[PDB]
Amino acid sequence: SGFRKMAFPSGKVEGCMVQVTCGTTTLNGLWLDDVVYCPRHVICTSEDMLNPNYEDLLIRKSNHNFLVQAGNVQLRVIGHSMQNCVLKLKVDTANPKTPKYKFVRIQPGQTFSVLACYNGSPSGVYQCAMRPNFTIKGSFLNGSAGSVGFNIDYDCVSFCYMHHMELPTGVHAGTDLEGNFYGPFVDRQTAQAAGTDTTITVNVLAWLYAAVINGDRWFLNRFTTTLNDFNLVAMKYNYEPLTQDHVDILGPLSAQTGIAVLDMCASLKELLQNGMNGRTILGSALLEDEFTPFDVVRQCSGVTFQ
Amino acid sequence: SGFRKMAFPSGKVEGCMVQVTCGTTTLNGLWLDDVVYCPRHVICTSEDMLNPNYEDLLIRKSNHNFLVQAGNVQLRVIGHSMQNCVLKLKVDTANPKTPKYKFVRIQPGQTFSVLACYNGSPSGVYQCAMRPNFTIKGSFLNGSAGSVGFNIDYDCVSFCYMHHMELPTGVHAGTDLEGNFYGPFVDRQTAQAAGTDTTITVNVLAWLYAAVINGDRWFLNRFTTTLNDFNLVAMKYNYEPLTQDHVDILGPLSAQTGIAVLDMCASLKELLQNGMNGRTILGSALLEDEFTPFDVVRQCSGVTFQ
Amino acid sequence: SAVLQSGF
Amino acid sequence: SAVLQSGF
């Protein structure tokens, strides 16, 4: 019993983190085989960051302008190129601790773990979700650019995020490992605004199923509802509308608990119209939307990784 | 900016976890140098667990009755002995991944990370606090006994907790790494009462300071109070009483934010009596008490580890 | 009762 | 504005 915001074990990722310095600007890099990946704004000074010309800035750089450190061992850069918003530094040493890995571009609503790093060293690990407006609610300071987000799938580490920047509302933006930003953001210090942060309804439902599994059942009622009537209510509270695909996805959790998906929707519909009456659910006083249905199964059935 | 329930990177601990099997009973062990530590109830069958006499159970146990697996590697047990509530398995191979480590006994209010494992394989990492009644509010299933809690300081992993059992109220209890229980619990399947859980007041105050650092200031009022007047209100809401030593620990956070501790106590007293009126603090609708003053400084200043 | 969380 | 979170 119990339910915590759980992160993946970070050991396979800690061994890939390096420090990348260009001039006076430092950030983190991801060392896979003989290539180091890092955000391209490492080549900016303070003066370049309002309107950087990355093509022109990169043509003035040579391999020796990049200082790459793995602990105390220095890695010499033997090649460099730009792929979208990511630099790829060819180094002379292949990382012996390179795990089996994949580069994946995730969708909003999916969760992953972030290994926050500074100066190539790990600071901490935590779990987050890609918000529907393509930001994440992270914990990042100056120096943390290049920290990565990941999922572990059996033996293969799936890299899905590399941190770049913070938006004026305290939320964060980054790219996939091919350099393409999540959302309409660009890597320059201009005024950029995030869209509406809607609540991920399918995740709230899965979290409510986690609550039942853990003995928290006070919110269950004998009512039922239709998808149409629930969605009319949910659009009023800035929840994402539910589709038949979401119903199918909650199938196994509904079957394990004996609560039909539309009965659980009726329960959620009542919690929106009446609030939580000062009560808590799984130790929370807010409806939690950063657990996917797979996250719940994985925690409540003890799924382990190699 | 941002504030997350952040765990320590787990890489150094993952390489110490092994599977321990005795008969049909399997759990996790901690392999450091040539010794494996595991909860002693691995020697029980399902029938022995209500009234186990561990001295009697050891009579028909030999070295070759313990099967110890470090993934694909098999470890031969060449000795065993019971030390308080843990077994120490002497194996023929010293762990080459042994980190620099210490055994520490933590006190109520301090926090640590837990690496939850099943069959000696990592499942996830999360951060928790030792409750004032010596339980932890974790996430554990059958088969997770032997998972360990730890802190990292500089280059040294500090082991403080080994998981044993779950209490009927859904909370968890374990030992330090010398085998001595946290709290008045014993390792048998009997009804056991824990003390009343109280809210860790100094931690709530540190988390309020973290809120101000990240720009949440709506709860700062014009009032101040005294230690006695605050503690009068605090004791009614099941808060630990604040002492002068707690005020001293919060000094640097108070100096950094420019908010005197007793002024922050006045803001907390109002949140207790009046609630949060639909607002949130650091994304939470409840007052969080699982961040120590040192945890806040660490996350908000980017402390890294080897 | 308390439950010892070994596996079988 | 957005802030690129490299360090100095």
Numbering used by the authors:
A (entry chain B), B (entry chain A): 1 to 306
C (entry chain C), D (entry chain D): 2 to 9
Which sentences from the paper describe this structure?
The main protease of SARS-CoV-2 (3CLpro or Mpro) is virally encoded and its precise function is essential for virus replication. Mpro is a cysteine protease that hydrolyses scissile peptide bonds at 11 specific locations, including its own release as the non­structural protein nsp5 (termed autoprocessing), in the polyprotein precursors. Mpro is a homodimer, with each protomer composed of three distinct domains. The catalytic site of Mpro is non­canonical; it has a catalytic Cys145–His41 dyad believed to be assisted by a conserved (catalytic) water molecule, instead of the more common (Ser)Cys–His–Asp(Glu) triads found in other cysteine (and serine) proteases.
